[PDB]
Design an enzyme around this catalytic site. Structure first.
Site: not given
Ligand SMILES: CCCCCCCCO[C@@H]1O[C@H](CO)[C@@H](O)[C@H](O)[C@H]1O
Length: 339
Positions: A27-28, A31, A33-35, A50, A165
């Site tokens: 879903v995203g 910067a 990381g990766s989720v 994440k 955040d």
């Protein structure tokens, strides 16, 4: 003791996660990381997982990795993002190379709410109340957020809200306190109250309050509303060049906020007047704002808890990669999930 993991190639990388997490889907990326969204079969919750990007590639990455894990492990409040789980496929420190964080998947942010929806006053009260409740908690831990904006406010269905955040929820400039754009370098916690003011104004009107094209335009828009600095404020400005410039400005008076926020609840206007003050020393605090009559229907002084003190002493330390990695491993190993 240790869960069984399963391997999967996703965005472009291997995801190795406990088999309790099922149906991963991106879903995203970027910067953060990766989720991936996922279903936690243990709890029946949807979660966000994440995978940290390049966590120990350099001293700076490693310290950032530590910082993010420490912060998220500390936050234990209903209106702040918290950690459901943290894990690594590694069996020992020597093979420890990847870190995954698991949080609630709240299904949206306040950007998506703002102009798919024209909010009732009761619902504005509820959203701002929950922001302030989470902020009281964060501030009590001696933490300043510094980047509160609608994309950092996660919101579900029932508009239950959590402050986020690290990407776990257009222009950031629009919500920044004036003193951040003047490079002040000492900040009050009430930098965050300015941002709440801007967010609240926008929920009321359906428009960005100060949609500056750049930092100078942004400041121009702000001064038109709140007026130019008074002498009492000018006494507290040590920068010679900033004083000179401010003194060059043609003076302008404070606008009456009633004329700007037409038809809003008079109590909301009052509260806005107390948040959007140039002098950070004279802004209402999160604690004081919770007690403002605008939130009479939601306020309970016995259910607005504070945080334990947060040890930020590591921010001043300069350590090696392997030292920041080891401290991070310690924090993974000591993690205790919430009830
Ligand atoms: C264009 C004029 C912008 C002036 C911004 C004024 C900010 C006033 O807020 C200042 O914040 C400082 C740091 O948080 C405090 O140390 C000062 O005491 C306070 O007056």
């Amino acid at each position: 003791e240790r869960p069984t993991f399963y391997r999967q190639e996703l965005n472009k990388t291997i995801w190795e996660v406990p088999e309790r997490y099922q149906n991963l889907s991106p879903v995203g990326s970027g910067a953060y990381g990766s989720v991936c969204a996922a279903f936690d079969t243990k709890t029946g919750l949807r979660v966000a997982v994440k995978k940290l990007s390049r966590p120990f590639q350099s001293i700076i990455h490693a310290k950032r990795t530590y910082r993010e894990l420490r912060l998220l492990k500390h936050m234990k409040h209903e209106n702040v993002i918290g950690l459901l789980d943290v894990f690594t496929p590694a069996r020992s420190l020597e093979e420890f190379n990847d870190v995954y964080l698991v949080t609630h998947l709240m299904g949206a942010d306040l950007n998506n709410i703002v102009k798919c929806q024209k909010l009732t006053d009761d619902h504005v009260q509820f959203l701002i109340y929950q922001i302030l409740r989470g902020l009281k908690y964060i501030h009590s831990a001696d933490i300043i957020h510094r980047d509160l904006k609608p994309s950092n406010l996660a919101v579900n269905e029932d508009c239950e809200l959590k402050i986020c955040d690290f990407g776990l929820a257009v222009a950031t400039r629009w919500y920044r306190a004036p003193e951040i754009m003047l490079n002040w370098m000492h900040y009050n916690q009430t930098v965050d109250i300015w941002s709440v003011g801007c967010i609240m104004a926008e929920l009321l009107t359906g428009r960005t309050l100060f949609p500056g094209t750049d930092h100078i335009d942004q400041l121009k828009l702000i001064l038109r509303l709140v007026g130019t600095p008074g002498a009492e404020l000018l006494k507290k400005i040590s920068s010679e060049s900033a004083r000179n410039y401010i003194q060059s400005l043609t003076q302008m008076p404070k606008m009456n906020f009633a004329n700007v926020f037409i038809g809003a609840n008079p109590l909301a206007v009052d509260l806005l007047e107390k948040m959007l003050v140039l002098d950070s020393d004279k802004r209402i605090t999160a604690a004081q704002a919770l007690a403002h009559a605008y939130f009479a229907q939601y306020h309970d002084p016995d259910d607005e808890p504070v945080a334990d003190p947060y040890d930020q002493s590591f921010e001043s330390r300069d350590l090696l990669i392997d030292e920041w990695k080891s401290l991070t491993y310690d924090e993974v190993i000591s993690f205790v999930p919430p009830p």
